[PDB]
Each structure stands twice: as C-alpha cells, then as structure tokens.
Amino acid sequence: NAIKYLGQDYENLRARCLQNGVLFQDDAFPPVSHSLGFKELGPNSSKTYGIKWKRPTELLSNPQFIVDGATRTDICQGALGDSWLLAAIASLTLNETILHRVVPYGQSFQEGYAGIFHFQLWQFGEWVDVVVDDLLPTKDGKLVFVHSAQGNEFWSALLEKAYAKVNGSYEALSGGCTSEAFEDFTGGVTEWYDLQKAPSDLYQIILKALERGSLLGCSINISDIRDLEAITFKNLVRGHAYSVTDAKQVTYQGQRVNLIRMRNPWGEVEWKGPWSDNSYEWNKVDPYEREQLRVKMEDGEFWMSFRDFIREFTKLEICN
Ligand SMILES: [Ca+2]
Ligand SMILES: [Ca+2]
C-alpha cells in the first residue's frame, strides 16, 4: 500500500469508472498540450503538429500491457530527449524484484479495464503510487514518445507517461541525469565514476554490481556545450544515456579480454568498432563462447572491450 500521489486512488477510480460506464480521464495530467510541453513541445510548436491523444484500445483491436515479459527491448525512445530515464527503465527490467515494484502486475486492457493504469515511484522521499489514463500522444496512429519493439505492447509507454506526469509534462523530461531516474525507481544509493580517471578495479566493481542486480548506465560528455544530443563518426551518441546490460570475459587470441555490453535506448544505432555485432574479433574466439555472447541484430545493444569503453565513454553511473 504505497502513498497515493495527489491522493488519487487507483482502485477507487477504476471501480468508479467501471460503474459509471466510462473510461478514466486524468484531471491531474489531462490529454492536452500542457501535458506535452511548454516550449519545444508547447501548443505553438511545429513538433506537436498533428499530435493526437489516443488510448491503445482506440489504436489496436488487441492492445496488451505486457507481451513476452517486460524486457529492455520494450524500451524504444521517441521524439523526446529522455534517454536518462529510458536507460534506467531498461536496466530496471534486468532486476525482476525492482521491476515488479515499479510496474504493478495484474494490469491489462481486458477484464476490469477502465482506461486507467498505475505505477510506483520513489518520490518526495517515499514510495508513491501514480495513476494515469491511457490516452497517449500519437501521430498517424503511432506513439510519439517511448514505445516497445512489440507494436501492441504499452506498459513502457504508460510508465513513461506516469513519470512525465509527476514532473509536469513530457518536455520537463527533456535532458537529465540517469541517476535521478535510478533513485526514483529504487530509493537506493547512486554513485558515478569519471571514466577518464577510472579505478584499477572498476571492471570488478562493474561485475559485482551487475551480479547484485544494481542499475548501471553510461554516457559521453563532449566539449561542445551549445547543442546537445548528437552522434559521432564511431556511431556513438553524446549526452545520451546507455544502459549497461552485461560484463563478460572472453579468450581472444589466447588471452583474457574484458568486455562490457550496453544498450542504446533508441533501440538502434550501435558501436561499429572492435567487438561490434559483425566485427572480425568474434572470429578469433571459440564458437561456444561467441555463441553465448554475440548477437547479430540491430537492436541498439552491443559489446565493447572494457579498454575501448573507458576511453570512448566519460561517465558511468551505478545505483547501489
Ligand atoms: Ca515485452
Ligand atoms: Ca546489436
């Protein structure tokens, strides 16, 4: 029984909509421009041209809250600079325990559906339950913001809306610190590392962190200040949070090489250097080992040697 955000009671509201034969519309975060934004996503912006609020039940004949589990592939960033949040959610899915906390199970578009969903966040120094109606920003029938690789899955889009709600609007989520999201999802201790001054046992730190199910994210801070959000020649994006999803050692040409796996919340655009999906290095590794690690697929997830990682990336964040 978490603390009810703004006093909105999920069960009561759902029950009331059901009895009144209507679907929920949230007075605290209504389907209007003010929930979208105030400037770049404000009512007078071309970025919001053609945006229409629609429920999944208005979009598809068989919408689903969760399809084939709530995993990181269900996190594909939309037209919003909230990679910090999205990278946190992706990592969150790697910890069943915390995942079930944030995303209450038992929600669907079938039995008991009334156009209302809820999520729990660590806010105001406590666990809070936040509700939202399922009206989502769309353009041409497709979700404008976060969406799942599964076109009929909506749990991540609804979770992102709930986070947008407590912050005031989707635009309020434009640009941020991955650690803030980690905290808002765990209430745990966050710590960051300057990769240019990486500890000698940082890889070891990463290993145990991943083992315990901690949340890890990394990013690249470039010189250019007046710009934000942009890729490079090495196909990496700056000021963009990536979820660190694994850390494994392999035998290359007869020796131990420390590798690290991460995922771009865009769900696409990957590193093309050593150890990339179709890189040459995978040929000089025993089939078994490379069969269990390498995956050829444009999914935004890829491996890098730990050596290249600490050179290319500048910041690493870990939640407890
Ligand atoms: Ca899924
Ligand atoms: Ca990949």
From Swiss-Prot:
<feature type="domain" description="Calpain catalytic">
    <location>
        <begin position="23"/>
        <end position="320"/>
    </location>
</feature>
<comment type="subunit">
    <text>Forms a heterodimer with a small (regulatory) subunit CAPNS1.</text>
</comment>
<comment type="similarity">
    <text>Belongs to the peptidase C2 family.</text>
</comment>
<feature type="active site">
    <location>
        <position position="240"/>
    </location>
</feature>
<protein>
    <recommendedName>
        <fullName>Calpain-1 catalytic subunit</fullName>
    </recommendedName>
</protein>
<comment type="function">
    <text>Calcium-regulated non-lysosomal thiol-protease which catalyzes limited proteolysis of substrates involved in cytoskeletal remodeling and signal transduction. Proteolytically cleaves CTBP1 at 'Asn-364', 'Gly-377' and 'His-399'. Cleaves and activates caspase-7 (CASP7).</text>
</comment>
<feature type="active site">
    <location>
        <position position="83"/>
    </location>
</feature>
<feature type="active site">
    <location>
        <position position="264"/>
    </location>
</feature>
